């Protein structure tokens, strides 16, 4: 943290943050969500980290170079240490990225190494080559060299993500899946795990071995697993919570903007809210069904009447304000809702659905005030505009993500947030073989368009390819875009260090501080 001169610090430097749900895991290779990553950034530090405004900055690596954007050399600071006092070395990174790549680990982010094009990743994922063949090596204890199969100019931007953080081999091997328990875990971020009470709280305490420990101000941070946005706001207003999760309750949000204006933070966020269609399951494998659902949903009603928290109606997967996004807004989005409804009805009738043989399916969402209220409204809108019957089903976060990966669903509420600010952070998840492809979407055409983006050596051709890829996705109605999120949350007046300038919202508690109040 960089405490501005003049600012008087509170005697007690403790923070309470709501985290939206119980984390899937604390193992960097077994996580795929925002809640998981929120805690991960305080415990495990990779090569680079985001500064307080989101710029890729030195993490364990203090300096780095690239040769033709294909060979990246990271110089690790000598004083980087784990919480047990042992050094963080390039060997830790070699082991960790190999473990991420290894099919045996079954990481949901195994494809992150494909997104970065680390040499030999495809064969390793397919079981054709051993994970030790991965294009990473330790040149010495403080030098990590990564070799890519093609030039990736934005490669370093990917490195702030949890999947490429180091994990302690010793603890993993000795304790297996219980390596993350408080008594066994070893961490290299600014914090250490103190307590972990499932469905109650995660308590982290300052890690004195952290290389930048002298700049850390918060001594303890508690992460809560409250999925009810109304409850989160209530516990924030009662004084228990210092920072709510960034999912806002439809019930209380208007109230709040008027009641506590200076505590309501609303900033740009690179995330898209959509209804994910299981593309490999009939009748959702029929593009006419998918298109009907996409068109019959009334974004104006949901976004501006039902939710109205500052969101913008969406027509794409990649947010249009992503760095490098120059998207073509589709004609259907410009039409009136009545025209969209008419077309939707025509397509469904073409697909075989009638009044005595209607389309009935499930709408899966993770427990939440916001998602439930929106799902009820969408169910109503689809029933009214298309004559479709939807059965709502809520699941807790960890179960919900597993269900989507399994493909044991029809339609699911979804929200993807960028991992790095570049269109492929979104687009790569729709690749036929992506480990993040819960849409179960497989398009050779789409795949080829993305493949071509690193075969050109200029941003204009690349951006046009991203635009065409979104057009392909939209043509196939892979998803039902709803709105582009805004990062809205409540932050107590005494919490300093939160700028809201980072569109990826990669917060580190080491950068925050409590002002005397």
From Swiss-Prot:
It comes from the Bacteria. Induction: Part of the opp operon, which is constitutively expressed. GO terms for cellular component: ATP-binding cassette (ABC) transporter complex; outer membrane-bounded periplasmic space. CDD domains: PBP2_OppA. Transmembrane segments: none annotated. It holds the Pfam family SBP_bac_5. One of its GO terms (biological process) is protein transport. It is found in: Periplasm. Disulfide bonds join 271-417. Keywords: Disulfide bond, Peptide transport, Periplasm, Protein transport, Signal, Transport. The complex is composed of two ATP-binding proteins (OppD and OppF), two transmembrane proteins (OppB and OppC) and a solute-binding protein (OppA). Part of the ABC transporter complex OppABCDF involved in the uptake of oligopeptides, including the cell wall murein tripeptide L-alanyl-gamma-D-glutamyl-meso-diaminopimelate. Plays an important nutritional role and is involved in the recycling of cell wall peptides. Binds peptides containing from two to five amino acid residues regardless of their sequence. Also binds cell wall peptides, such as L-alanyl-gamma-D-glutamyl-meso-diaminopimelate. This is Periplasmic oligopeptide-binding protein OppA. It comes from Salmonella typhimurium (strain LT2 / SGSC1412 / ATCC 700720). The lineage of its organism: Bacteria, Pseudomonadati, Pseudomonadota, Gammaproteobacteria, Enterobacterales.
């Amino acid at each position: 943290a960089d405490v501005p001169a003049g600012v008087q610090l509170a005697d007690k430097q403790t923070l309470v943050r709501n985290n939206g749900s119980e984390v899937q895991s604390l193992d960097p290779h077994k996580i795929e969500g925002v809640p998981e990553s929120n805690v991960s950034r305080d415990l495990f530090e990779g090569l680079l980290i985001s500064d307080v405004e989101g710029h890729p900055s030195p993490g364990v690596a203090e300096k780095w170079e690239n040769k033709d954007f294909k060979v990246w050399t990271f110089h690790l600071r000598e004083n980087a240490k784990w919480s047990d006092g042992t050094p963080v070395t390039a060997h830790d990174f070699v082991y960790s990225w190999q473990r991420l790549a290894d099919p045996n680990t079954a990481s949901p982010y195994a494809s992150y190494l494909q997104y970065g094009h680390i040499a030999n990743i495809d064969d390793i994922i397919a079981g054709k080559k051993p994970a030790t063949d991965l294009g990473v090596k330790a040149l010495d204890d403080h030098t990590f060299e990564v070799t890519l199969s093609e030039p990736v100019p934005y490669f370093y931007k990917l490195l702030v993500h949890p999947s490429v953080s180091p994990v302690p081999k010793s603890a993993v091997e000795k304790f297996g899946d219980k390596w993350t328990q408080p008594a066994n875990i070893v961490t290299n971020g600014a914090y250490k795990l103190k307590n972990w009470v499932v469905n109650e709280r995660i308590v982290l305490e300052r890690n004195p071995q952290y290389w930048d420990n002298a700049k850390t101000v918060i001594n303890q941070v508690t992460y809560l697993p409250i999925s009810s946005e109304v409850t989160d706001v209530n516990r924030y207003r009662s004084g228990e919570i210092d920072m709510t999760y960034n999912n806002m309750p439809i019930e209380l949000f208007q109230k709040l903007k008027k009641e506590i204006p200076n505590e309501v933070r609303v900033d740009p966020y690179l995330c898209t809210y959509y209804y994910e269609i299981n593309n490999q399951k009939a009748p959702f494998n029929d593009v006419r069904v998918r298109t009907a659902l996409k068109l019959a949903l009334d974004r104006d009603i949901i976004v501006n009447k039902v939710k109205n928290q500052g969101d913008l109606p969406a027509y794409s997967y990649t947010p249009p304000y992503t760095d490098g996004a120059k998207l073509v807004e589709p004609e259907w989005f410009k039409w009136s809702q009545q025209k969209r409804n008419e077309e939707a009805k025509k397509l469904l009738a073409e697909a075989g659905f009638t009044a005595d043989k209607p389309l009935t399916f499930d709408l899966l969402y993770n427990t939440s005030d916001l998602h439930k209220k929106l799902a009820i409204a969408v169910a109503s809108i689809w029933k009214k505009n298309l004559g479709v019957n939807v059965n709502l089903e809520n699941q807790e976060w960890k179960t919900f993500l597993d269900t989507r990966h399994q493909g044991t669903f029809d339609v699911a509420r979804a929200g993807w947030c960028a991992d790095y600010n570049e269109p492929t952070s979104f687009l790569n998840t729709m690749l036929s073989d992506s480990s993040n492809n819960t849409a179960h979407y497989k398009s050779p055409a789409f795949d080829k368009l993305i493949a071509d983006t690193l075969k050109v050596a200029d941003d204009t051709q690349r951006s046009e390819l991203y635009a065409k890829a979104e057009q392909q996705l939209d043509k196939d109605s892979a998803i039902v875009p709803v709105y582009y999120y805004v990062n809205a949350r409540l932050v107590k007046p005494w919490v300093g260090g939160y700028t809201g300038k980072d569109p990826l919202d990669n917060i580190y508690v080491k950068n925050l501080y409590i002002i005397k109040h």
